[PDB]
Symmetry: T
Subunit: 142 residues, 12 copies
């Protein structure tokens, strides 16, 4: 029923910066798309974004206590944070890793995720629709 969508560093800059790359969709519009699609699937999306690792960890902690699934786009921390991986290893519901860009078509350092090994699955390079597709997997898996 409840699904947590968690965006990490720099995802608040979505729809600025690099139109050709991630889409001209902003993070507020992204919140709007997700919530609407979530309601259509009979779910509630709680969508949160932060540039603070501590904040992201608090949100993962709450999802762990609540046994709620998480869709997570950790931004740069995907490639660097063991702390975030440790927090997510607690999750009992599904963890779906989502990246807007195709991380495997960029620099080599982006082709390693500390999250993928513990995630249920990963969607990359499908733009903002990756979030919607993660919602749909979660809807068919209850």
């Amino acid at each position: 029923l409840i699904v947590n969508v968690i965006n990490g560093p720099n995802l608040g800059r979505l729809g600025r910066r690099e139109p050709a790359v991630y889409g001209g969709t902003t993070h507020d519009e992204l919140v709007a798309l997700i919530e609407r699609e979530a309601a259509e699937l009979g779910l509630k999306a709680v969508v949160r974004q932060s540039d603070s690792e501590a904040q992201l960890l608090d949100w993962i902690h709450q999802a762990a206590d609540a046994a709620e699934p998480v869709i997570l786009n950790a931004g740069g921390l995907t490639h660097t944070s063991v702390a975030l991986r440790d927090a997510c290893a607690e999750l009992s519901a599904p963890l779906i890793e989502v990246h807007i860009s195709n991380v495997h078509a960029r620099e080599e350092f982006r082709r390693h995720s500390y999250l993928s090994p513990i995630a249920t699955g990963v969607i990359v390079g499908l733009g903002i629709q990756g979030y919607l597709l993660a919602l749909r997997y979660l809807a068919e898996h209850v």
Copy 2:
């Protein structure tokens, strides 16, 4: 309108072998699920499987000439074939890489794909539903 779903080596063994891991769904049932979901989205799925790299390459060639999108689960060749990557680099429509299992939770050799860098996107670890989610991306991107 037309979408090619191409499975490589060992995907004909789906629904035997390892129930706990990939699902008790067989490849014939997979064909059935895909085709049904494809029709519901207003698409036609052509679903083909082969253990022969030459056969897979011929199918990619035909999709290249026809300018048709491809959903591709190359099996083991994902990690080993430069030939298949070269064939796919020709595709003008989208290429979505799909793996039933979470390749990042297995052996290290499975965490490198020669296909990901040239694919539009990648779905891993979401079971058979990854194919359906790839269909839906293709349906929203025409």
Copy 3:
């Protein structure tokens, strides 16, 4: 006399999550054990935990100005943070690195610490008693 015990990310989740692994002891109980053992050794333990690197750094800074020893379980940041290492390189009193789990029996990425090279010593895999043993070293080294 005064000893600072500093826990980093995810150590507030101790005694939840993974009973078999780290103990069913919570972080509040850990605070209680440490403080009691500290008093028995004639020391005062100031025990602090945070998921925020900035907070951990502020605490290391204060210990540096006060010339106070530090027992540090940095959590995931053990393996990733150069910033925390730089802060700790200032410490003039002893720095004892402590990990509840045996980091050398887990993933390869956990077998490298940016802190060990500058620490006085390291205790891993001895459970919550590692903190108590660090206290005792500090008590015999004044």
Copy 4:
């Protein structure tokens, strides 16, 4: 006209800690030197320091929206943060990376910067004067 000087973790500890290494100049004195030199060049220096990655990212974001150049000494995050690099890749004005110490004469881990590839240029090992020299480049490049 406006130039942002951004210092990351541990740069507030400048002028304590290690006299022989970075100078006995404090961060307040550094602010003072920069601002004075900036006025002499006809510029305004906004000089900010934080141990918080989130704070540094917010400041980079603001410089990106304002199209303002940045002189950045990210401290330890130089070597570890993909998030900070992603934020800086947005900057349209020049980014000058500055390190007080010669990072190439220290540990091997310090000889890789996630920032250098996207910076306009890099000054290392020239002490506090590196900041002043970055100001002068910015003054001659308008």
Copy 5:
């Protein structure tokens, strides 16, 4: 009740050689300290040292048959011996790895132990007191 303390190559040279580094304590004094502390904890320490891998292996074998815990400072063999690791993998009681020096502050080759992955825990860099702290863990874990 019975605890085996096993020192490997060069530990008989303790208290010669390098006063500044390992202590001016000799191995006979070390035996004396351990035994005294062991009695105070209600344990019996059997402390043995050898430069011969075969001898160390025989001692590990005997501890394995007797189901006795082992505190082991294998000296150089820590970094090189698979044979010793195989012998120790048999131990059913706890194995505590102890190094007098901080092996992580020395050459890179010393930062890998074939023993750590199979040990219960590891104490490094706490001088001769590491042995005493290992005794205390063993005393609190019966």
Copy 6:
């Protein structure tokens, strides 16, 4: 007072070849800019360029005997010559490494310098002004 500016292989080709990359400034103009700026700082710049490692080494030798500072752009030899590093390790006055291009934004082989570890500091990617900024550091450090 006297400062030696030493350019290595291919720096005589400056202002030909690649206008977009290094500037349309020629090496003669570079000599002119440096000398003029040097006089303005109260210094004398001796600016020499050679494609011959032996010649560069002779010049470093002379600066070593004269106890004169050196600004050095070794060209390709930056990345390849141990001989040049050995010659420069003799210098008692400051050695400032300068690269016109941002070597960290190019091929991986250019991100390692045999000179940086022994240089006082390094300026890269600031164009021809890097030489002028090196002069200014040398002027403020007498």
Copy 7:
């Protein structure tokens, strides 16, 4: 009772090519030796060779469905094929890897097999008799 001997690429060239190296025995003679020895052990050897990975995979599939043991000399695919490893991971009876030459005395690339980790055991460098010895293990293990 039934045992499948499967040779991969280039094993049909046995007894040509390189007399000194693999033996002057041809593949037909090898079939003959195996079958004769198999009958003497009370087994039936089905011996098949192909240069086609697809063919080898079909044969492994059939052995998997039949729960029959396999002796496998995959030729070059030993070192390169993940597909073949995936097919063999299904086998419920024993898989014995056999190489005529000593692969560890040749090029480095030949010292890694994708098959060894999932095989029951491996025989290399014992010439054609390795096949016979694999038969004998299979005969003593029913």
Copy 8:
């Protein structure tokens, strides 16, 4: 007199796909050019292409039995196939490796060939004329 020109995977797609890169020459035209140039040199070119490794191996086998020289563009298998290398190691006449594109100016994985170590020589990056130049070497070496 007789020379075998063997093209591997994807070489039948020549003259489609990527005009700027490999030429707008098709594989049929390539056959035509080769055969014509071969006759002019007094040779007969047998030119064959296949996407099937098994087919390529059969052709190498036949050239080995016939003691005929081979010009080989293995396509992607250049970088991946040990089987093909083993087949070619049998050749007693010259083996000339040919690549239309400059493989050293592309991805790193293309700069290693399993064939080059056993080939007589290698021609890369000279377009379709590389085949003609290989023919001419073979004509001057009888």
Copy 9:
């Protein structure tokens, strides 16, 4: 006629320790099996075991002087000893390397043997029968 079977460190612990892994067969029983099978083949097995590298080397030396073949299970020294390899490089009769467990299905460090490159062949993972199969190769190769 005479064959030397040499077991290294920890092989005297066979049939204790790990029933599921190596067999509940003891080393005395192993001696008994080998000797009996050896007599049945018309050979004499001299079977020796030691935890001492010096002892193993003396035994290899004697086999070298006597021109006698050796079956060798060096235990942990397989992966670590250059000395043992040097001793074995002298052997003029066959050297067969034998491991009871499948070393390629364990830790990565066990997949490299200093002995395999100089051995005639290697048998791994076939349990105690590997020794018997080595005897049989030696019986068919006189």
Copy 10:
């Protein structure tokens, strides 16, 4: 029309030293062969050899100013010189890299060229005829 053939270190020793390896052809004879073949193609070959990197660089510079193609056998500098690569990156006409020996059949260090990535193409292992074949490519590409 004009083509520059440039040989680097040790190519003046051709036809001495190692008859079996590079040919008993001397460098003077090589000059003679090239010039004759060049005239037959309607070209003029300027053939120069030097053991001095500075000399080679001067010659590349002149070809760059003259917009003349270069055939280059840099000798050992192939594998070591960034300076020479930088000089050659200026060339606007074709650069053909030529090696008499098959560099891929020798030591590993010879299988990397700093020149190949910027060359038009590469000919190796075809003996002295590689130079002639490079001439012919240049003749067909005007």
Copy 11:
């Protein structure tokens, strides 16, 4: 005055085994040559050989207590033993490492010595005369 010559594993096999490689000189003859040359230089050579690491360590210990110089050919342990290096790091007189063969012309694993970094110097590949030359250095350095 007194000099210790210490040979490790397999050096007692000198003058057997491999005439072409190390010389037909035996270890007894080597003792004889050394002692004679030592007397001629006014020194006493104590020459000892053992296949036992423990024995070698005891001998190094005695030289350490006696402040006597050591010439050491550790055999295979050169490349593998940290224990022996630790023992030798105690030596206050000179340590000269000697290898009869040129270790840099053999396998890659032989080109790393744990002893060279702590030795005064190293002589390799000069046959048995390396020992004599080490004696002469020791004679000129008192």
Copy 12:
């Protein structure tokens, strides 16, 4: 009879620069010592030094034509020059590599020599006497 002593880059700076490290002996004194010792052995030493690789190569060439032995201290080029190695591979008389300092006790890059694999032997860390000891080997080997 005639022996060539060849010093490479920076060896003319001997006896300046770093008294503690290489000796206060100058290169002229070194020439004097060598020549005197050479005469005492009945040899003639031709001692030459250059900072120019081309010059060193010319000298190696002359020794190759004259079949004269070479003692070579290539300086920095030891670690970097393939050209010099190629020149030296021609030498038919002995090549002895000599380094004044212990290259294995310095930076890692100095522990690899392109010359050692082709030299007869190597002397390092024995100061200027290494040259004299090389002379003596050459005197005993005619």
